[PDB]
Every structure is written in structure tokens, then in C-alpha cells.
Design a protein around this ligand. Structure first.
Ligand SMILES: *C(/C=C/C)O[C@@H]1[C@H](O)[C@@H](COP(=O)(O)OP(=O)(O)OC[C@H]2O[C@@H](n3cnc4c(N)ncnc43)[C@H](O)[C@@H]2O)O[C@@H]1O
Lengths: 9, 224
């Protein structure tokens, strides 16, 4: 789960 | 009948005239994601962001924008499976609904809804947003919608199908792994191999308008 997040930070 | 869970992303609506994220940059409609796709971007320049989504909402309702063959095939799939079918989309468009699907889970929200932010309540909304209401859209850093029902369906699925999604954005990109853990057969249908394509047991590549009706038809015929 977790928040909506993109593969790069 | 098998329990089937379908995940869709922007690729299934590309051929319907809704342009996709160009992977080469970090730009959406010539905008940086940080500026139009984060809570912080919204706080920083509310009227630009409101204008951006006002634009997206209008373009969605243009006559030349219609469900394509892939959207239609998923409506036929739901017709055949009943409550053993669940459709989860990352898309904010309403093309699944216009195609005939019902109970579509919009885990990233909907363009045709806005949110009274002191409220938690989403409200139907088809026009511009003027002068604080916000788009009912899940931004980066925010929690996706309907996750409880989605993860329950993932644990129960006999077949998990991911369509038109690049595997960059979590938690959606992690659904294939979760499905496999609970024994589901996994299928990727996409224009090109996704970032998580190696996780899928079965895969077919090409435009959704061709690949999805083809897969759906061979699924339906395998039933009877
Ligand atoms: C947050 C906020 C939205 C307002 O979410 C959006 C989006 O929902 C999320 C996930 O992105 P995704 O839906 O996976 O889309 P892309 O990352 O841009 O990848 C597109 C995917 O589609 C394929 N594709 C393009 N064209 C086609 C056709 N004709 N047929 C099938 N497939 C196609 C591409 O090859 C990509 O794999 O991130 C955002 O933040």
C-alpha cells in the first residue's frame, strides 16, 4: 500500500 | 467462473484521444508533475492548478473523445462474469462508465468530481471550478481510494489483468506481485513492456484497441 508514489524520488 | 480483477491505466484511453504521460520527461501536458500533481503544487499556485484540471475536465467532454474497442471489451467482460469481476482504474476519465462498466473503482479519483476539502465528501462536477474546492484527484503523496476493497479482490482473484499501465506508480504497480502471492494468474496487456512486466505470467503487446478485445474474446470463449 502506501501513498501514491513514483518509482523515482 | 474465475474471479477476474482488471487494473487499467492511461494507455487504455490513449486511442480515445486522451494523451498519455510522455515517459521521456516528467511532463504532463507540458506541465511538471510537481506543479500540477502534488498537494504542494496546489497550495503554491491554486489558480494554475485549478485551470489545469478545468482544462482536463473540458477536453474529457469533447465530442471526439469516445470509448474505444478496449473499453467496450471490458464492459462485455463484466456482463459475462457479474460479481466475479472487478475493474480498478488509475484513470480519472469516465470512459469505462461510458463503455458500460459499473462499480468502477477509481483509485486515483475522477475528473468529473470535485472535493470540498474541509469536507471529505466528493461532489459531482462537470464544469469549470472558479473562486476552496479541489479536483477529486489523488495527488502524489496522498492515499489512493478504495484500497481496502482492492486488496481484498487481489487476494481473491483467479486472474489479474493489468492494461495500459507503465508500472512506475505505486501502489498500483505492486498489484501484480500481490496477486501472484495469493495464487492468481497474471496478465499484462500493454503497448510496450512495463517496468514490472517481468512479474507477469502472461503478456501481449500492441495497441489496447486490438490487444484487449483479442484477449477478452479468448477468455470468454474459454469459459464455455
Ligand atoms: C495520479 C493523478 C492523476 C490525475 O495518477 C496518474 C496516473 O493515474 C498514474 C499511473 O500512470 P499510468 O496510468 O500507468 O500511465 P503512464 O505511466 O503514463 O503509462 C502509460 C502506459 O500506457 C501505454 N500505452 C500508451 N498508448 C497505448 C495504447 N494505445 N494501448 C495500450 N497501451 C498504451 C504506455 O506504453 C505506458 O505503459 O500516474 C499519474 O500520476
Amino acid at each position: 500500500g502506501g501513498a501514491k508514489r513514483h518509482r523515482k524520488i | 467462473k474465475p474471479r477476474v480483477l482488471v487494473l487499467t491505466g492511461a494507455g487504455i484511453s490513449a486511442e480515445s484521444g486522451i494523451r498519455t504521460f510522455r515517459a521521456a520527461d516528467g511532463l504532463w501536458e507540458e506541465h511538471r508533475v510537481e506543479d500540477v500533481g502534488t498537494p504542494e503544487g496546489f497550495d503554491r499556485d491554486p489558480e494554475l492548478v485549478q485551470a489545469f484540471y478545468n482544462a482536463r475536465r473540458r477536453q474529457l467532454q469533447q465530442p471526439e473523445i469516445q470509448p474505444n474497442a478496449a473499453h467496450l471489451a471490458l464492459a462485455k467482460l463484466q456482463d459475462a462474469l457479474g460479481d466475479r469481476f472487478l475493474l480498478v482504474t488509475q484513470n480519472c476519465d469516465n470512459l469505462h462508465e461510458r463503455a458500460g462498466n459499473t462499480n468502477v473503482i477509481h483509485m486515483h479519483g475522477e475528473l468529473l468530481k470535485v472535493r470540498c476539502s474541509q469536507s471529505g465528501q466528493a461532489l459531482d462536477w462537470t464544469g469549470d471550478v472558479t473562486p476552496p474546492l479541489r479536483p477529486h484527484v489523488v495527488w502524489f503523496g496522498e492515499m489512493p481510494l478504495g484500497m481496502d476493497e482492492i486488496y481484498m479482490a487481489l487476494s481473491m482473484a483467479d486472474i489479474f489483468i493489468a492494461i495500459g499501465t507503465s508500472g512506475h506508480v505505486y501502489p498500483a504497480a505492486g498489484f501484480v506481485h500481490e496477486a501472484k502471492l495469493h495464487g492468481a494468474h497474471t496478465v499484462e496487456l500493454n503497448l510496450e513492456p512495463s517496468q514490472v512486466g517481468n512479474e507477469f505470467a502472461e503478456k501481449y503487446y500492441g495497441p489496447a484497441s486490438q490487444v484487449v478485445p483479442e484477449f477478452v474474446e479468448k477468455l470468454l470463449k474459454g469459459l464455455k
